[PDB]
């Protein structure tokens with residue numbers, strides 16, 4: 042192609058962000074346009090490349106969470122714990138996924154990052170990854186302007202190389218694409234089309 | 242009447258392999274009395290202020306080395322993406338912060354939730370250390386495999402371990418005697434879940 046990126050089984054990790062019914066199904070609280078289209082591509086990357094580790098994330102709010110309009114927050118209720126919408130989408134292939142990590146778990150605070158949670162408090166993701174030798178993390182999924190954005194940014198904050206799989210992501214708001222992209226690039230995240238990836 | 246108060250800063254709960262195959266009717270590898278645990282683990286999971294709670298999952302490829310069909314001990318069980326591999330619907334996942342899969346490659350097994358049989362780490366240790374876990378509570382199945390080895394590995398990684406003896410069932414009841422001895426002087430504490438209290 043134009044450039045080659047070798048995926049390493051010792052050193053490269055993959056994060057699959059909020060691929061859940063509530064974000065992806067037509068019915069469902071917070072539908073992200075072009076959400077389901079990503080499945081095809083993500084399923085293939087998880088499938089055919091040999092990452093050291095793979096993590097999918099899960100927005101996992103209580104019935105009465107702070108970020109809901111019913112309690113003063115920006116969003117409609119979504120990804121309530123044990124609700125159908127909170128489940129990972131049936132079209133996702135979890136077979137090569139070593140861990141599911143949950144966020145937004147406490148009534149009082151929201152989390153867009155896969156790394157932090159209840160304020161200062163960690164999810165232990167940064168820890169586990171480091172602990173297992175991972176040096177460079179790839180990110181795909183939803184929402185580009187939220188979970189993907191902050192997860193990629195906290196990964197830099199924690200010392201990882203970050204590569205965002207450009208074509209395997211979608212946003213709540215496309216007007217935010219300019220703003221967010223700049224912020225990513227200037228924080229040293231490298232955006233990249235998945236078709237540039239090859240195995241060892 | 243000797244209690245154990247559970248901390249929201251240091252104490253972490255591990256629920257071991259509460260999946261369809263070990264538990265449900267027509268599951269391929271049945272742990273006797275495994276379904277009956279569901280009441281108590283749900284209570285411990287929801288009534289206690291653990292820092293963190295982790296559900297493990299046996300998660301095997303369809304041609305796994307540990308299957309009898311390939312010369313291992315066990316019927317095909319917990320195949321990746323199968324009815325059988327799912328966590329039992331009757332377990333309340335609401336207060337679980339993470340699910341960890343194990344026995345994930347064809348060529349290696351892993352009774353422990355800490356390490357695959359070939360030294361590869363699952364990441365569990367680093368996660369628990371990251372959040373500041375200082376002791377782990379273990380419950381689920383199987384007492385004589387997953388639960389035993391997790392306990393021991395938690396002890397190698399330098400965690401205190403309390404084992405909820407009433408919230409476990411074993412694949413094999415006779416083995417119970419040999420495992421508890423090994424756990425006893427592994428420094429592990431055996432405790433009925435009705436000894437746990439909050440803050």
Ligand SMILES: O=C(O)c1cccnc1
Nearest residue numbers: 059100153183184187188
């Ligand atoms: O993608 C996310 O992180 C997100 C977006 C809206 C609501 N909850 C989570």
Ligand SMILES: O=C(O)c1cccnc1
Nearest residue numbers: 299315352382383386387
């Ligand atoms: O107890 C376990 O984890 C176990 C037992 C048999 C087969 N696979 C896993």
Ligand SMILES: [Cl-]
Nearest residue numbers: 045046047048
């Ligand atoms: Cl490279």
Ligand SMILES: [Zn+2]
Nearest residue numbers: 100102108145
């Ligand atoms: Zn949310």
Ligand SMILES: [Zn+2]
Nearest residue numbers: 299301307344
């Ligand atoms: Zn097994």
